[PDB]
Amino acid sequence: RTILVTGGAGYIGSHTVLQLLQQGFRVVVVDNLDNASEAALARVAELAGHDGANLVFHKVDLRDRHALVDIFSSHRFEAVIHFAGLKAVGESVHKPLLYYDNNLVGTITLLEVMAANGCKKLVFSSSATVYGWPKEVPCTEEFPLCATNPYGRTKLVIEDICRDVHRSDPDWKIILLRYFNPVGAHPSGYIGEDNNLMPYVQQVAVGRLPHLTVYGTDYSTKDGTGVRDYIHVVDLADGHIAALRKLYEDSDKIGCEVYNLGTGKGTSVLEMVAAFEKASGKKIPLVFAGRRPGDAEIVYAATAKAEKELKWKAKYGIEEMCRDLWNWASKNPYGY
Amino acid sequence: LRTILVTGGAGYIGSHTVLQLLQQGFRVVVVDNLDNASEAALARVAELAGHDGANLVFHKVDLRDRHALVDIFSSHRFEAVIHFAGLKAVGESVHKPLLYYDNNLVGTITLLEVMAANGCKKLVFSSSATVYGWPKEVPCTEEFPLCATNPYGRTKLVIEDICRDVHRSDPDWKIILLRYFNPVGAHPSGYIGEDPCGVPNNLMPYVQQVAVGRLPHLTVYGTDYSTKDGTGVRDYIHVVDLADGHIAALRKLYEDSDKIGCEVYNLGTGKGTSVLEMVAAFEKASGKKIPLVFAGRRPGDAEIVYAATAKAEKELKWKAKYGIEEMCRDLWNWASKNPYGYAG
Ligand SMILES: NC(=O)c1ccc[n+]([C@@H]2O[C@H](COP(=O)([O-])OP(=O)(O)OC[C@H]3O[C@@H](n4cnc5c(N)ncnc54)[C@H](O)[C@@H]3O)[C@@H](O)[C@H]2O)c1
Ligand SMILES: O=c1ccn([C@@H]2O[C@H](COP(=O)(O)OP(=O)(O)O[C@H]3O[C@H](CO)[C@@H](O)[C@H](O)[C@H]3O)[C@@H](O)[C@H]2O)c(=O)[nH]1
Ligand SMILES: O=c1ccn([C@@H]2O[C@H](COP(=O)(O)OP(=O)(O)O[C@H]3O[C@H](CO)[C@@H](O)[C@H](O)[C@H]3O)[C@@H](O)[C@H]2O)c(=O)[nH]1
């Protein structure tokens, strides 16, 4: 069984490719290497051992229709997992056309080529950013949707495109996965991430930054700092194995489904700092600051739908995430 | 010399706007792929424009053809772009959503990128009152909540949001989004007008085909709404008034650029008219009788929608000059002189 993984050289994608190879899939990755190194997939192939030969890599942009058509014509794909996209919020505010072009034109082209080739099974990387600034927690998949920056708008637009495609053509089977806050690295520390709290904390721990600025101390949370659902990247990867299994075993009873991928636990900024201090043995000097414009106060997942319908629950906790980030970053201070 | 690039200018609203522009002395470059129009509308525009027809140049190009679009922008100095190009059939958008997302979003994104790279950051965009969805009150002001109820409507709202994000990223952009209400009618000469393919999806093109004998009756979709007669109520605006609202938008960009960023204005009349009232007005204009069939509501239809005109009146200095009687007169003149459209 062969899976096309767009964006598979990136953070979540590379961890997912490793698990797919262990599960016995043939994997074809398409990635333009805009935001990733080819070394990530070389290392994934090493970690895959006996299954490393089942990984094929093509340096292709999804907007290159001809190149994409040739990839689909050379393989019979069971499904596509679509991680490719740009994701930096600040860059999206400064360069919105870059984001709308890359994310929307790349996705639309992929969907068209998929339909023309008869591959109508998709798993899409969405994000909890589509819940906006939620009025209540935990956030269920039925919550009101609204994006708060151009990057988030691209994710919500793509979800809506997928729902419209499914309504137009019931042969499509689509799973949208709303990831919460990814942290960590494979526990080998040989692959990992190469703009967010925990990467900043780790840089403070090694002295590359003098302090962590804490954005907001007057929130209505236990310690006054912002609260998020931090989820180990290996758990996120595993949720994609569950999504392929759902498409493989339960396609007759799904259409365009959406599931949160989170832990269901909210952890504050200071709690994550404390967990990282314990993992690293380092102190993280703090500067307390005002709220950061655009920040939600508290966001975490309602896990019930994923637990019952996707048959998936996260397995790793925040201390483990912090240890695995520390291990990767200590062994690889400059990434790959 | 002032030159305007008009995308989608071979279509219904675009052709009427091209004509008004030519009559004001603008040079007009039209980009249109002719997917939903023929050259005939533009050739009649050029005929009505007299010697000013020499000031209309037509480029048969798709907005997604980046190389061809770059060639146009690099060889012209444009004061502004008016962007009418797009697909607009609701039912087709539900059945073929990728066609709509591709044409409308990829075309618009390509256009904005080519504009920005070639130093033309002045845009007037064809939006729609569809973004108000099912309004909780009327009249609808520009600050009402925005939604989309079908894939076509989603493309319009997404493009409005792209434009707002582009402006926020780069204050040299000046963008006017125009939310059209329900366009009806034709230039009073009767030489140009709406020429739909197939069975018309909208009320007044359907009515006129009944009046000229090509279809046997109008089906009325829904008679149980909470309105005066039970049928849907809309703000019908003469297409020539819509065209004049674009002249007003260009004037605002030309004279008031500093005070604006990415602004939005309704283009409507502020009056709601029901389906039955439009049929009666068309019977009076045409002298024909329109037989009716009664049916249930059409999925997705709003009950009552009409414009709050105060912002356009104050800030664009624009108000509609035509009423329902004139819209119906002008539609009938186009229909009876061209019962089979441009093809004859
Ligand atoms: N009249 C309405 O029902 C109505 C009301 C509100 C808003 N609008 C919007 O107003 C605009 C004009 O309306 P209209 O009645 O003149 O529609 P129309 O279909 O007559 O005009 C659209 C024109 O755009 C052209 N076009 C489409 N895709 C193109 C592309 N990629 N490149 C170049 N040209 C392309 C078509 O060939 C057509 O001539 C449209 O964008 C429409 O969505 C429609
Ligand atoms: O230097 C920092 C960075 C973050 N925070 C706080 O830490 C928490 C997490 O922040 P961050 O890592 O920026 O994540 P989010 O605010 O949840 O959102 C970012 O991270 C998400 C997960 O990767 C993405 O989906 C979003 O698009 C992206 O804006 C927030 O409460 C922040 O206020 C700080 O106090 N100091
Ligand atoms: O054969 C018909 C067609 C329409 N109607 C009724 O007539 C009214 C107007 O319908 P229509 O002409 O189809 O316009 P709307 O659906 O209001 O849509 C128009 O008004 C919106 C506001 O801009 C635009 O988005 C649309 O593209 C534009 O075509 C509605 O109450 C319809 O139920 C009928 O009874 N029979």
Residue numbers in the entry:
A (entry chain B): 7 to 200, 206 to 347
B (entry chain A): 6 to 349
What did the study's authors say about this model?
To further address the molecular functions of BZU3, we solved the 3-D structures of the BZU3 protein, both in apo form and in complexes with NAD+/UDP-Glc and NAD+/UDP-GlcNAc, at resolutions of 2.6 Å, 1.25 Å, and 2.15 Å respectively. The flexible sugar moiety was held in place in the vicinity of the catalytic triad of Ser-Tyr-Lys (S133/Y157/K161). S133 forms a bifurcated contact with the sugar moiety of the substrate, whereas both Y157 and K161 directly interact with the ribose moiety of NAD+. Drawing on the structural model, we designed mutations within the conserved catalytic triad and found that S133A significantly reduced catalytic activity, while Y157F completely abolished the inter-conversion between UDP-Glc and UDP-Gal, and UDP-GlcNAc and UDP-GalNAc. Consistent with this result, the transgene of BZU3pro:BZU3Y157F-YFP failed to rescue the stomatal phenotype in bzu3-2. Taken together, these observations imply that the catalytic activity of BZU3 is required for the morphogenesis of maize GCs. With UDP-Gal as substrate, the Km (Michaelis–Menten constant), Vmax (the maximum reaction velocity), and Kcat/Km were 1.45 mM, 1.41 mM·min−1, and 650.3 s−1·mM−1 respectively. Km, Vmax, and Kcat/Km were 2.67 mM, 0.69 mM·min−1, and 172.4 s−1·mM−1, respectively, when using UDP-Glc as substrate. Our biochemical data indicated that the epimerase activity of BZU3 prefers to catalyze conversion of UDP-Gal to UDP-Glc.
